[PDB]
Amino acid sequence: MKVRASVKKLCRNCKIVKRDGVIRVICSAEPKHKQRQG
Amino acid sequence: MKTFTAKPETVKRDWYVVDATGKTLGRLATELARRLRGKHKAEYTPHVDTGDYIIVLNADKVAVTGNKRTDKVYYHHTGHIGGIKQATFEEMIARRPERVIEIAVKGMLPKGPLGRAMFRKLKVYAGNEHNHAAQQPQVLDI
Amino acid sequence: SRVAKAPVVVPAGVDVKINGQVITIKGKNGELTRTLNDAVEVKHADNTLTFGPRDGYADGWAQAGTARALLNSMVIGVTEGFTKKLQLVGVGYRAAVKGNVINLSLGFSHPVDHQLPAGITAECPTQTEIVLKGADKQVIGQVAADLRAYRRPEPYKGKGVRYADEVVRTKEAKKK
Amino acid sequence: LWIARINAAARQNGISYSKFINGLKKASVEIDRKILADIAVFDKVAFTALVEKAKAALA
Amino acid sequence: MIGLVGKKVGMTRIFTEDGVSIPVTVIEVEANRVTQVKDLANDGYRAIQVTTGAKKANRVTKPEAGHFAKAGVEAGRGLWEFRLAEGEEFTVGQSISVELFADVKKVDVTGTSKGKGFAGTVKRWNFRTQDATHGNSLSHRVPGSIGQNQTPGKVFKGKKMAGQMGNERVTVQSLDVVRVDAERNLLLVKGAVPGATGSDLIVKPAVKA
RNA sequence: UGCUGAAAGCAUCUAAGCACGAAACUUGCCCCGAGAUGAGUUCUCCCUGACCCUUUAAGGGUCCUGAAGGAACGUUGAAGA
RNA sequence: CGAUGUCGGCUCAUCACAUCCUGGGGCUGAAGUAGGUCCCAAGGGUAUGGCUGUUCGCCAUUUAAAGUGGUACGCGAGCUGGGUUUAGAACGUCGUGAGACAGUUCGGUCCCUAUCUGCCGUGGGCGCUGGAGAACUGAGGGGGGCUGCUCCUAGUACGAGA
RNA sequence: GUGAAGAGGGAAACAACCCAGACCGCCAGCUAAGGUCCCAAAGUCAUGGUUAAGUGGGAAACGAUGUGGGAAGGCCCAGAC
């Protein structure tokens, strides 16, 4: 995962939302793809 | 160019009370400080402090609730290894609702021996108790 | 901003008191439901209602689309009730409910108990369903969120407290 | 130092010091200076009658 | 529930069948006179004054004699005050005794430690003595280095040096009531307490449901 | 970590409005503590005298003889340089 | 440069947080127990024995850790004074030589009548107002703060099981 | 070009940077740089432009449907996202 300041694009299967100021990313089908800050 | 003199033995103060309901911090601080130092009625000024007393009996009802109630630090140094003591406005008003306005009014006052003699007359009240039954302060607008 | 520009209709047989302090409503599914006034004001001079900023308060126009949502739910909570979503899943874990006081058995030595707020009813109609009844959509959401404080279900077995709405699934022998 | 009793008296009649004093500059040729503004110390109406005059003269 | 006063008679080991030998402290309890009760306008709370002797009737002054006249002037050995809350019934009409402990098992004692005011770094502050041989110049009894150099410019508050020792209030809490006698006005407690043999002890009950 | 939800008709721990959480933070604990000059508070004890001057609601002087309480003095301390 | 005591040894502080341990938990090639990695956090904690001038190093046994840094890489108007960095001696080398030496050891001082800021106990005033006496408020400050071992829940969760 | 040999107003406090080069005064006027809620003298001035945050008030490469403006293209009100 890592703490990150880049969100970019990395996997087309990701679902993105801005939550409590930061960008959150979760991926249903492709493995390990996740983000908790951005 | 002399035109007047002060007389600290003449009696003039008559007490007035303000309602904190609907009042903001910088408003209540500046509108009280100018009336406590005196810049609106009988100005001499800068020489002595010319206010007639102006007080608050219920300090908590200030309108600081939509923005910057989650703000400030009110830092205090005790001189021990515990460091500087921090409190947010929402903590500071909750323990002693007089202090956030007594700090702000003092932040709207001059400093040194006369600026201290203004603050000695600030006389903000605490405890939600009727103690003005003969003082009889009339209610003043800001 | 979109939704405060548009109206909502008062359903037939619903009774409102809406022209002063404390808004009161009743209907088919709820009686003496009331709320205290806030920064948004509703217009009742037609069978359709519209929202705008209440005088004597601040920034209520940015809140008018939010007031609409809480009002629509305040009608739903007296005309038909709300959607049930809380569940407890996996063998050896089950809820207990008095009507009245609710408890979860979910593998902790914590109490995992709730005395309920006023006007809230609790039911556990199956081995895995939980239901909360009332007229405030937020209280039946938040009582469920205290019941969702322990035993988070994992992507290896899926056992614990869950909603009928999820961002995680179980995956077996996954890549790697 | 004299400003202390001047600005505080304009600010009690709906005008700023910087507009009050310039209203007395728009009056043309007539005497007004800061050392001569002390009429309020004897009677405050004497200054009120000059501030209402400055407001009329400013525009 | 209030408090009581008595004298530290001494301490003696009582022995047990499986060990240990257990010191028991003996407290000789006085007729605690109940000289005063605070009520009307007394800061919204109630508090009682005990009195622990009769002193001498020749030594009294009128400001003390009138203030105590409501129970007669005695004022001996110490007055002491305790807070009266949740007490149900009023304390006046009988002198308080070890009946305060007829059901209670635990107590807290304010021992008042025997004075040792002379102090020192080895006696108070637990520091060593430094180098009796091999070489050392006037640094044999010291709390080490009292402050770091240059940048601080000043001495810190709360250092391990100077002051006085003993004569603290010093509470003790890990006690047990061994015997009570309301006819003799006598109390026995397990363990050691601050204060010398022949000194006066303040005690109050400890309860948790 | 969340409920309820608008900006983004979906979505969203936040903006309005609600709920939880760390050996931290603040109390409680233990001791100090109104010079807190922002100089707290109760109870008890005591005192019911005259005269003069400038002249005056200010100031100074004279006589009469004094309560409540303290101080002095021991014998000395478990209280001390 | 009319003169900031240097290395190591002893004795003892204060602030950071870039966290070794202690509380929290996220991601994972995380079933579970773990390992690998991430960051909220500096309130409490963070050995001992032998060799050397000694840090630096090495070795043996202990540990919830055997954290890193600032403060002249903290404490000579601090203790110690073996090295470096005094007069004398003694070895190896270069030079014609006085000398010189990315060559090295033996003996070698550590001063202080405390003024001011500070710190730690303790007297005496002025004050709340007519004077005295007994006692208690709580605006506020300080202290306190981690942890080893074992047992029950339980061989419970997860997992044939291990 | 200035401090060297340059005083004054401004830059928190500042030599050299900014305004200006001081013969000596005025209970006198007028401006500069800078400044006018309060500390601390003076507009919380008139009118227009921009951001939405303690930005303003330390800060990079980098990253996000944060977003107003500009010119076209597409879908677009017998019916768009």
Which residues neighbour C52 within 8 Å (Cβ) at sequence distance 6 or greater?
Answer: C4, C40, C41, C43, C60, C61, C64
Range of the domain at C99: 82-163
Q: What is the CA radius of gyration of chain E?
A: 23
Report the nucleotide nearest the CA of residue E68, measured to C1': F44
CA distances from B96 to A8, B58, B64, E38 (A): 49, 11, 15, 29
Is residue C173 in some structural domain? no
d(CA C161, CA C176): 28
**Phi, psi torsion values for D17, nearest 5 degrees:** -55, -45
Is residue C171 in some structural domain? no
Contact residues, chain A, for C167 at CB < 8 Å: 26
Which residues neighbour E153 within 8 Å (Cβ) at sequence distance 6 or greater?
Answer: none
> Is E59 in CB contact (< 8 Å) with chain B?
no
Contact residues, chain E, for B81 at CB < 8 Å: 156, 158
Report the nucleotide nearest the CA of residue D2, measured to C1': H41
A11: CB within 7 A of chain G nucleic strand: no
Is the same domain home to C130 and C93? Answer: yes
- The arrangement of strands across the sheet holding E36-38 comes to E36-38, E47-49, E81-83
The CATH number given to whatever domain includes residue C118 is: 3.90.930.12
**B97 SS3 class:** coil
Cis, bond preceding B56 (omega within 30 deg of 0) = no
E44: CB within 7 A of chain G nucleic strand: no
The whole-angstrom distance between A27's CA and the closest CA on chain C is: 9
- Tokens encoding C76: 């739903």
Residues in E 64-93 whose C-beta is less than 7 A from nucleic strand G are: 64, 67, 79-81
Residue of chain B minimizing CA distance to D10? B40
Resolution of this deposited model, Å: 12.0
CB contact under 8 A, B40 and D12: yes
Write out the H or E segment, with its range, that includes residue E14.
Answer: none
d(CA E206, CA E175): 10
Angle between helix D17-26 and D44-58 (nearest 10): 70
CA distances from E152 to A12, B77, B81, E145, E149 (A): 59, 16, 13, 14, 7
Q: Which of residues 33-52 of B touch D (CB under 8 A)?
A: 39-41, 43-46
Handedness of CA C140, C142, C145, C146 (dihedral sign): negative
Alpha carbon of residue B112 to chain centroid: 17
d(CA D14, CA D55): 9
Is the same domain home to C93 and C32? Answer: no
- List the alpha helices (DSSP H) in chain C: 64-76, 139-147
Split into its structural domains, chain C has a count of 2
Residue with tokens 């548009």: C6
- Tokens encoding C2: 């979109």
Cis, bond preceding B45 (omega within 30 deg of 0) = yes
Is residue C110 in some structural domain? yes
Chains C and D touch (3+ CB pairs under 8 A): no
Residue of chain D minimizing CA distance to B4? D41
Covered bases, chain F (protein CB within 7 Å): 1-9, 11-20, 25-26, 30-32, 37-38, 41-46, 68-70, 78-81
d(CA C18, CA C24): 7
Residue C121's beta-bridge partner residues?
C133
d(CA E43, CA E63): 23
d(CA E181, CA E187): 7
Dump the DSSP string for A1-38.
----S----S-TTEEEEEETTEEEEEESSSSS-EES--
**Phi, psi torsion values for E63, nearest 5 degrees:** -65, -25
Is the same domain home to C28 and C55? Answer: yes
Handedness of CA E51, E56, E59, E62 (dihedral sign): positive
Write out the H or E segment, with its range, that includes residue B134.
Answer: none
**Phi, psi torsion values for E170, nearest 5 degrees:** 35, 95
Is the same domain home to C26 and C50? Answer: yes
Mutate: best of B43, B47, B114, partner D, most D CBs <10 A: B43
CB contact under 8 A, D4 and B4: no
How was this structure determined? It was done by cryo-EM
Contact E110, E198 (CB under 8 A): no
Q: How far is the CA of C174 from the C1' of G33 (A)?
A: 21
Is residue C19 in some structural domain? yes
d(CA E163, CA B139): 55
Residue E204's beta-bridge partner residues?
E108
d(CA C65, CA C39): 12
Is the same domain home to C98 and C33? Answer: no
Q: How far is the CA of C150 from the C1' of G4 (A)?
A: 64
d(CA E56, CA E76): 8
The whole-angstrom distance between D4's CA and the closest CA on chain B is: 6
Please identify, among C76, C98, C122, the residue that sits at the C-terminal boundary of a domain. Answer: C76
Residues in B 47-106 whose C-beta is less than 7 A from nucleic strand G are: 76, 78-83, 85, 95-96, 99
**C119 SS3 class:** coil
Cis, bond preceding E185 (omega within 30 deg of 0) = no
Is residue C101 in some structural domain? yes
Contact B55, B15 (CB under 8 A): yes
Report the amino acid identity of residue E125: W
The whole-angstrom distance between C94's CA and the closest CA on chain A is: 29
Is residue C175 in some structural domain? no
d(CA C27, CA C81): 11
Residue C96's beta-bridge partner residues?
C103
Write out the H or E segment, with its range, that includes residue E98.
Answer: none
Residue E205's beta-bridge partner residues?
E107
Is the same domain home to C51 and C88? Answer: no
Q: Which residue is nearest to nucleotide H29 (CA to C1')?
A: D33
Contact E141, E148 (CB under 8 A): no
Between A26, A28, A31, which is nearest C175 by CB?
A31
E138: CB within 7 A of chain G nucleic strand: yes
**Phi, psi torsion values for D50, nearest 5 degrees:** -95, -35
- Tokens encoding E79: 């007055």
> Is B91 in CB contact (< 8 Å) with chain D?
no
Report the nucleotide nearest the CA of residue E83, measured to C1': G136
Alpha carbon of residue C103 to chain centroid: 20
Please identify, among C57, C76, C95, the residue that sits at the C-terminal boundary of a domain. Answer: C76
**Residue C16: other Cβ atoms inside 10 A:** 15
E-contacting chains (≥3 CB pairs under 8 Å): B
> Which DSSP category does B90 fall into?
H
E173: CB within 7 A of chain G nucleic strand: no
d(CA C170, CA C156): 5
Split into its structural domains, chain E has a count of 1
Residue of chain B minimizing CA distance to D7? B39
* Burial of residue E71 (number of CB atoms within 10 Å: 0-12, 13-18, 19+): middle
* Burial of residue C85 (number of CB atoms within 10 Å: 0-12, 13-18, 19+): middle
The whole-angstrom distance between A31's CA and the closest CA on chain C is: 7
| Total residues found in chain A within this entry | 38
Range of the domain at E30: 1-209
Contact residues, chain B, for E158 at CB < 8 Å: 80-81
d(CA A36, CA A34): 7
Handedness of CA E114, E117, E121, E123 (dihedral sign): negative
- Tokens encoding B6: 């002060």
